[PDB]
Amino acid sequence: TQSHYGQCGGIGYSGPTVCASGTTCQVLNPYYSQCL
Ligand SMILES: *[C@H]1O[C@H](CO)[C@@H](O)[C@H](O)[C@@H]1O
Numbered sequence: 057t058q059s060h061y062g063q064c065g066g067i068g069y070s071g072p073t074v075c076a077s078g079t080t081c082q083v084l085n086p087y088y089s090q091c092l
Pocket residue numbers: 065066067068069070071073
């Protein structure tokens with residue numbers, strides 16, 4: 057699972073888009089999405 061303050065899954069990011077329990081994949085920027 058993607059860690060806190062890391063990029064979870066934005067446009068172009070291929071990988072584990074599911075964040076760790078309690079952290080939410082928030083799309084901050086068009087490509088930058090972060091697990092908060
Ligand atoms: C890998 O997966 C990511 C998932 O967000 C895509 O954005 C990318 O285009 C590729 O399919």
